[PDB]
Design an enzyme around this catalytic site. Sequence first.
Site, PDB file in Angstrom:
ATOM      1  N   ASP A   5      28.323  44.531  45.215  1.00 18.35           N
ATOM      2  CA  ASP A   5      27.798  43.839  46.393  1.00 18.35           C
ATOM      3  C   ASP A   5      26.530  44.519  46.913  1.00 18.35           C
ATOM      4  OD1 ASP A   5      27.488  42.310  48.676  1.00 18.35           O
ATOM      5  OD2 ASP A   5      29.335  42.978  49.646  1.00 18.35           O
ATOM      6  N   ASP A  36      21.084  39.721  47.358  1.00 15.53           N
ATOM      7  CA  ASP A  36      22.515  39.936  47.652  1.00 15.53           C
ATOM      8  C   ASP A  36      23.402  39.419  46.514  1.00 15.53           C
ATOM      9  OD1 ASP A  36      25.004  40.326  48.729  1.00 15.53           O
ATOM     10  OD2 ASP A  36      24.790  38.888  50.370  1.00 15.53           O
TER      11      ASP A  36
HETATM   12  N1  LIG Z   1      27.207  40.140  50.441  1.00 20.13           N
HETATM   13  C1  LIG Z   1      28.458  39.869  51.141  1.00 20.13           C
HETATM   14  N2  LIG Z   1      29.687  40.662  50.933  1.00 20.13           N
HETATM   15  C2  LIG Z   1      30.659  40.242  51.679  1.00 20.13           C
HETATM   16  C3  LIG Z   1      31.174  41.398  52.549  1.00 20.13           C
HETATM   17  C4  LIG Z   1      32.303  41.282  53.356  1.00 20.13           C
HETATM   18  C5  LIG Z   1      32.720  42.361  54.141  1.00 20.13           C
HETATM   19  C6  LIG Z   1      32.002  43.551  54.119  1.00 20.13           C
HETATM   20  O1  LIG Z   1      32.343  44.696  54.886  1.00 20.13           O
HETATM   21  C7  LIG Z   1      31.672  45.883  54.520  1.00 20.13           C
HETATM   22  F1  LIG Z   1      30.993  46.485  55.553  1.00 20.13           F
HETATM   23  F2  LIG Z   1      32.580  46.751  54.008  1.00 20.13           F
HETATM   24  C8  LIG Z   1      30.880  43.655  53.322  1.00 20.13           C
HETATM   25  C9  LIG Z   1      30.465  42.583  52.542  1.00 20.13           C
HETATM   26  C10 LIG Z   1      31.745  39.639  50.794  1.00 20.13           C
HETATM   27  C11 LIG Z   1      32.463  40.534  49.777  1.00 20.13           C
HETATM   28  C12 LIG Z   1      31.826  39.216  49.333  1.00 20.13           C
HETATM   29  C13 LIG Z   1      32.734  37.995  49.106  1.00 20.13           C
HETATM   30  O2  LIG Z   1      33.724  37.848  49.736  1.00 20.13           O
HETATM   31  C14 LIG Z   1      32.307  36.972  48.042  1.00 20.13           C
HETATM   32  C15 LIG Z   1      32.984  35.773  47.918  1.00 20.13           C
HETATM   33  N3  LIG Z   1      32.593  34.887  46.978  1.00 20.13           N
HETATM   34  C16 LIG Z   1      31.553  35.155  46.159  1.00 20.13           C
HETATM   35  C17 LIG Z   1      30.882  36.361  46.284  1.00 20.13           C
HETATM   36 CL1  LIG Z   1      29.543  36.544  45.124  1.00 20.13          CL
HETATM   37  C18 LIG Z   1      31.258  37.256  47.223  1.00 20.13           C
HETATM   38  C19 LIG Z   1      30.019  39.111  52.589  1.00 20.13           C
HETATM   39  O3  LIG Z   1      28.620  38.894  52.018  1.00 20.13           O
END
Ligand SMILES: NC1=N[C@](c2ccc(OC(F)F)cc2)([C@@H]2C[C@H]2C(=O)c2cncc(Cl)c2)CO1
EC number: 3.4.23.46
Length: 374
Positions: free
Chosen positions: A37, A222
Amino acid sequence: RGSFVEMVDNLRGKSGQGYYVEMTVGSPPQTLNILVDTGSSNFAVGAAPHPFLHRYYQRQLSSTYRDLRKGVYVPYTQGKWEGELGTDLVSIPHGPNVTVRANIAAITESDKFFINGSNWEGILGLAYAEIARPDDSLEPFFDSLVKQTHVPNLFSLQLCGASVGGSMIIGGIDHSLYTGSLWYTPIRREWYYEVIIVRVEINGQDLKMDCKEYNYDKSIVDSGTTNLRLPKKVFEAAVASIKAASSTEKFPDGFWLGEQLVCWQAGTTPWNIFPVISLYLMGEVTNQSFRITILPQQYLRPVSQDDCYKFAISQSSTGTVMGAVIMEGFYVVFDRARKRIGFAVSACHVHDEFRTAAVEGPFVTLDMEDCGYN
Ligand SMILES: NC1=N[C@](c2ccc(OC(F)F)cc2)([C@@H]2C[C@H]2C(=O)c2cncc(Cl)c2)CO1
Ligand code: NA
Ligand code: NA
């Protein structure tokens, strides 16, 4: 430098559920699949038997776990995760042959975070400490990796769309993963991987918006977002132009809003009615830009006895998001040492016989610094 065969093909994924890498945590090593991520900055892993999880981090089984005696609560939309912070020994089996003591958030409670049916159990936030939770003193994984080892301060990503896969090259570049030349755009500021878009063309036609709109309130690269997300006003202008380019066939108004799919029988998708989409990015040199071009193969996502696609461009209130829709066309180099992001045509991107994704420069673009929102 240039060749890292043991890291090629170390990513796997299910379409629309992101790309993950195998990691191990603790001693003896516990293997987990971890979403890569570039849009966040915490290494956070399932640490309790949530029903959706194939597996989870069992800290009691690790002789090297150190408790930081601090919790972390992380809301967003849609959803939330909460956890307990510690450190432990982390390795990437199909990555560099090193082991690092990294911060890990042990997730003990979450909502709309884990996906039912997905094969990953945590996320590897590869962005900068400025957006880490709870604060920028929680050192992100890649920062620890570079501090504690000799791995060079850069990584690169080749995301191959469609079961998907690709490559995360940690500490360098593999020239087999791209064709042509790399072109670099500056990382505007080290928080997200923030860049500046300076011009947008649909099928070569300029949207002619004040370029500050393209970066309202930011533009980021991203890997943890599926779609190309465009600021509302830019999205409105963008669909309108795409609607017009694609008007030889008609689609429900809801399709363009992602609210319903569109289908065609197999082999019958009309790629060419759809325009290419070009983002010009700020270059390395004053008044110099370059452009990356993607196909409907990128922004029409495969999801009946027909090939049904989702329109994978969508409006945003958090600025432009270059998600998998962009990245699947390119080899993307996160050149942290030089605070720049390189793009090259990906050796694995999906196209047809008539159009290819492209990275082209140089172009003359003035007043590019005006494009950045403050
Ligand atoms: N770039 C971003 N990551 C997320 C995320 C959620 C909490 C955070 O908490 C963090 F601070 F630990 C960090 C990122 C999600 C993890 C990603 C997610 O669920 C996802 C679902 N379907 C497809 C993809 Cl490619 C990804 C939100 O947007
Ligand atoms: Na180092
Ligand atoms: Na090459």
